[model samples]
Target chain A: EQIKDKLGRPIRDLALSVTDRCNFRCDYCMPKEVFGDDFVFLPKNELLTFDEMARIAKVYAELGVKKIRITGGEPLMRRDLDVLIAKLNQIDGIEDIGLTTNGLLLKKHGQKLYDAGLRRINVSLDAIDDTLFQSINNRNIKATTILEQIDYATSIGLNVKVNVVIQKGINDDQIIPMLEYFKDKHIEIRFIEFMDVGNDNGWDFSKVVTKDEMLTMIEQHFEIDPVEPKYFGEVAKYYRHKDNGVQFGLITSVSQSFCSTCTAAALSSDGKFYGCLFATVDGFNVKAFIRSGVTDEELKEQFKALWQIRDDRYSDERTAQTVANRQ
Target chain B: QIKDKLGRPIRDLALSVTDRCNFRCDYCMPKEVFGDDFVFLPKNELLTFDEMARIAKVYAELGVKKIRITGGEPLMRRDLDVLIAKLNQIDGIEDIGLTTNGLLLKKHGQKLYDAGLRRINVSLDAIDDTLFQSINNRNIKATTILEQIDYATSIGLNVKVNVVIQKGINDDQIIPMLEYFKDKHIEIRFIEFMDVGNDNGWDFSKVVTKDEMLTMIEQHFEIDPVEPKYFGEVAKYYRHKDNGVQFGLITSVSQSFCSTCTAAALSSDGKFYGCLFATVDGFNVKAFIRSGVTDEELKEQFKALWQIRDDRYSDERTAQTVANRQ
Candidate 1:
């Protein structure tokens, strides 16, 4: 089915979260206070199987989805996740398959994933200083551990991009150091503004470090240039080093919102479809329909209807008052 | 001699060689306003190559890396290559480029290239004859400009096509113009119709935005986004996914990139404009030159002006503001 949102924006990208559990208790995403000891996570049976994911991916491909990004609370936490990578790789019409990980398990699985045709990987590394990194992730791991995984991934011919989430007063100082380390390397580093993704992480407007401020901070050191977005719906605003081809990018949802061209639909671990990242509503459950013996044709129609009616511009309309009162 | 700023340093200098233009491009130098009867800047009133060079040295001391010779159309001025050679010899200026209507490029391409001008941006709005004439109002066919562009590239000059897109005017030619330049491997930048100089019918209704132009181009070609080559580079570039040729958009009207604006314009009469759509002139350096001010004192003045400079006219521009200025 040829599908486009009401704005004529195509459904070209999908973010499929494979697991609800993450090893790192990063304060912004999954803080220790709420998610420690006794919190319930999704059971193995509820998560989509490789075959089920492949089936859903095929339907999405039919609807003009060319890029599939395997995400998670840390997608590498899913056991033998390269197995899913291998499955998604064989799907026709899907030109690119990427994975977003926290880079803990990447050192071990980097070669396997690269061999499985997963060329692109975005590893989340918030800070470089060991003490600060430990405090940010709360994982007691050195920054070098993640750096080693990134190096290993790049060494294995996997196009690795680093994601550094900048929260106000919290790892914001690491912006220059991150650029200094990665600017010369083949890997591109993207600085992301602290977003209000889920409710549990204590998200506030005060905590968000905007892209403009980040650029201002960066301009203190390096001479940078602005690069155009690679395509419509690209979240990162890219810039290049004046002397070298080395580049850095910004995901500025808080400051400069790109809601008009948002073409991504995210699927949670248990098969819940969220149109926006900060969606408060319990989204549509495709797992229930799959369990009820829905055919591929019916699933395609449902996908079309869901995408066609999509008009989510949460970030574009976000204000200080709205952010303060958000669930 | 060099210093740093919070962002990228002012690297680009747009030196208007002459306020005189041959073709009457409606957006820039319209025929109705700048008719034959209008008093063009006399040769003495305009800065000579030596005066421009002296002024350029002051800017170079402040960290300008590149110089672009502009005008009503830069090539309209006589012996422009001589001026280009002078700017090229400056200590800090690394690259020299020129922005023209591409009318005189055929005659001056070899001379300009020999004089160290490597890059050129030619203003061509339409490919169709009637439409081209209507936009330019000079009765000049699009092929005449197209031939000069070809001649420019043949001489090893890097040519970039600049199209000023207006809503009802040549917005229809966007796709065909894109297709024309895509095969040539030359980057074409579509400039959003802007309100510059308070003339030639500036209105919100006539502005065809960068988003609108990009949407039209994407329908015809599969394109990929390109990162800005440097900070304060005005054009947002994109490459055709299959062909490998790139295109760009100058969205001054729709998406104002005032935060990274590193360019300072020197008008033909030697008035330094901090912003492109600036209503008032700040300082006249040519008068200083005529008054026998030393280079050191001029350098001090130049550095002082640049140090406290904060001009963001495009960011603050509104339809009402534009109309009010007019």
Candidate 2:
């Protein structure tokens, strides 16, 4: 892709995957049934290292990308992940660098990441109920330890963002409670609708609590005002509390789509830059360059070239035609 | 600049950098101005590139930042990088872009990017070898124009394709045109056939509405309506579901957005035009420069013009301003 859309909105924000391995298997992302012992992730040699990811991020930045958010099956599962953040921070034109983790080892590594120029943190906290969290996660970990890690990370000056996926009868009631708990703190609590992440999760339309319903419920208790995004293509609907300055966000991937401003490109922990998260295809491959000894400037030019020709705005134009043949 | 007046949308200033163009598109624009008796501006009548940038700075001060440089063919202008570099220096401007006919973009693409110009929209109607050559009213092939687009895109310029849809005249090529640009990541905007100037034989039956245009694309390609990117953006954007090729339609004839239209125009002869289609006498900037006005004086004068500018010509096209009102 070598040209931009008519609006001059370039494809920038990249959510790269360093590794597909995660210690805690969440129901929504990687359920226990599908991601059991048989789940085959990319081999260690196939993965892009810290130096490799930094080169790709540098290339994307030169092409007008200003932000990079690393995602995974829990990116912290990779060895020396904080060092990767350190490498990405050194790239010019990368204004913000952050990640989404399950918070398993964040308490131990959060301080080092904060020191490495990691600004924002999004921890996946599916439910507060111990029984439900254990059952959904299908793991031996307790929910209380995860919440403690969130508290620990925020205390050390990392801008923590808590991500909660609300299922119908499972954890929907936690919506109000989750807002109340994080309302007093400066941390941003983002409530994401339980989406059909993989082929499973039994994604039902009725289970989706649209962004409007979530905002209306919060507005009844706390005064909320719409805030302009700090930068273009920010996916979350940001709102700040009137009196407390306690900001919160909502990600309605099901009911509402931010595809028009869909600037984030995902790298599937394996090093392939995916144009869309929903699509089953990868647009380009930079993992090959990492193994083939491609220089940093060359990788940067590749990222820039891909963004110039991006015209993807699927969420803004979701119609019968789009649903029939999804890209 | 912060005040928002009711019925007054933000205005855009479109500057014509040069009157010289490479192609002679047959609808209304011609190679030469007109008959032998018609007079073209000499070298001194036209404003210099620096002069245009100074005027753009003045417009930006009055809260006009969106600038689009057009021309009889703008790329035909000499050392276009100079104009782009100067315009890029103006503060408070959100975007600085250009529109060309695409014949010269390939040669000047990298130079423009180095000069701080990144966004561009090129006008190309037909895609077929014969139809494109015939519709352009010139001997230039369509393949050469496509190569120019590829080259500009390679250099990191956001290039958009502008297609004018006319009935009984290359209208049948609409579907194939969309198919060609599909998956290329370039936006192909279909413009309605309108009576922009006197030369184009404008008629009711010949005009194509946006609905008809989208329906035609929907028959072959899966199309859906995408929201407008910003507040004053002119085109209605759509995308093919399978390929992600964005299609934009400008229904200026069947559906004119003149009520929401807020734009000022400047001709090659340093004359400012308030409306594109309206017949109004242009303010002579050549004379203003000769008077040796300071930058602050020019800023004040530009502000006064916009404050009193109620020239809604598209809405009141039937009012006929040229004969009576000054």
Candidate 3:
């Protein structure tokens, strides 16, 4: 459990993406230029199967991996992903099993995924205006339609959370209105700092509102009080409206980092296990292992070795001198 | 912008004075760790006013000429005026300033002004007491901040107030805040909510944009965009058309300025840090300081370390790999 770097911070979260093939073209994460029709994502054969992912998860779990959030370009886009979730659910020590998605397919697949035992859900809803939602998402679909799907997932007894990526000029006007709409819902609404996740999306710090700014903005409008995290590695800082409504939270990863208790590692659909979401390079080869007929024991060993050696806490060491221009 | 004579990239430096602070700002480090059991940096862990001045001297030698001393609440730094006096002595350093939440400035303005501290940036996000207290995450009122600002202005501090804009959170206060700060000559900047450190539950959807921020303020006051004062200045400055109110933009998230970057950091412990988003820091100066290394020897190391630096992580940031993972 003591996975420390030379500086002595622990590795806490592992965020794995089952697939990059999402049904929605979210401007922040999967921009059209990079993920267009001509875009080359991982081929079907390149991705890790459920067994391989489970093997890697088991290795990480052995090395103190307690929380796992399954992410994707759109995780639900993966065919029968519940099987993979079920396999991961069987892992003895993964204290949390969550998924981040566009929620377009969740309405149809929520029951099955809930049955597969997904612990929580984070849906990306950037706008409430149907027209603006279409423009922001670069899709014909409306945000209200997606909100309905979120309702569907929540009705099924699944813990539902909403993630909104705040692009300064694009959707800044709608954020308050959107918050007003979601205040009555029980699901948590988390505002994410706009990130240059990939080289695309034209990110600028000028566009990013700091966590302090966001907290100021919220506390000004609503009577709210802070709530403690339910557990150690909980990413969002929870808060409750003093009057009455759904609880809300923030994920100020860009401006305010909580790298001390960070314990997320990500695995690409192509079988590469990434200890950091910003990982420009990673190690893992599902195709090579599958083609080489590598056994589960070998895969588990590979994962354990990776996790044991894991020591990436980029946020904790930030100083004013640290370059914010790049990752 | 011209590269420095050493061919090093010229960049701005924001320095932390005390990891300890009097006010518990919710966004920076919440009240949880800063609570009663909160273990702030011991006196030794913090660079002395002289030590910081000396470090700034070497930093200027290595092409870092701009320095802004900050803290949990920089005004809480004891004898900060004395620290400013030391900072002003360093040659090649063009700017010596402080960023504070502004509670203690009411009493210390004259001393800080006489110490050669030319500029001050204050954190004031709301106009009302209830909203201000909630944002500070402490029981402090917004009026205390405004009072401190007024005192600093009377004492000749080039003051600017920083306001962060979250979509629903404080977006409504945009017009109100601008109206108050505009005519007073105190520049108020609205920032987009960013996910800086991993802990603040940042999501981009909460950010209020420059245009939205501008429009919200412009709706009540006449405003116009203005150019930045210098190269590598993070904030994009804007002025009010009628009243001449000025503000800046620190676009760390929306507008990433990584290409022309030329900056490195030295932690209080004497470790050289290169990237803000990186978790790894190398070249420990603490060991050298403890080992009785000469100033020239340290200078040689600093030059060698800084000269070979080229970090362009944000320009190259992709989902392909996380920047600072082990």
Candidate 3 stretches with Cα past 4 Å from truth are: A5-7, A197-203, A228-234, A290-297, A308-327, B1-59, B64-90, B94-298, B305-326
lDDT of 1 at A127: 94
Off by over 4 Å in 1: A1-250, A253-327, B1-8, B196-203, B231-233, B318-326
Better of 1 and 2 by lDDT: 1
Predicted complex 2: CAPRI docking category: incorrect
Candidate 1 lDDT, A7-57, residue by residue in tens? 445577789989999989988779999889999999899998888889899
Q: Chain B, model 1, TM-score against the native?
A: 0.91
- Compose the digit string of candidate 2's lDDT tens values, residues A1-327: 222433234455788777788887776667888989887888898888787677677777766667888888788888888898888888888888878898889888888889888879889887776787898788878788888998898888887889988777788777777777778666688888765432322224456665656765676677665565553234586777877888888886655444444556778777776666765566577777667777767776666666656545343323212222221
**How far in Å is the alpha carbon of A253 misplaced in model 1?**
6.5
Q: Model 3: which docking level applies?
A: incorrect
Per-residue alpha-carbon lDDT of model 3 for B1-326, expressed as tens digits?
A: 22322233545566767667777666667888678996777887776666677667776775677787776677777788888888788887888767788888878889989989878888777888898888888788888888888998988889888887767667787777877887687778777765534432324467665545654554566544454443235676767767677866565444444544566665655566665555666777666666777677877776776666655444233111122232
Best-matching candidate per DockQ? 3
Residue B194 lDDT (model 2): 69
lDDT of 2 by residue, B223-274 (tens): 5556555333568777787766788888565434443445778888888766
DockQ scores of the candidates: 0.02, 0.02, 0.05
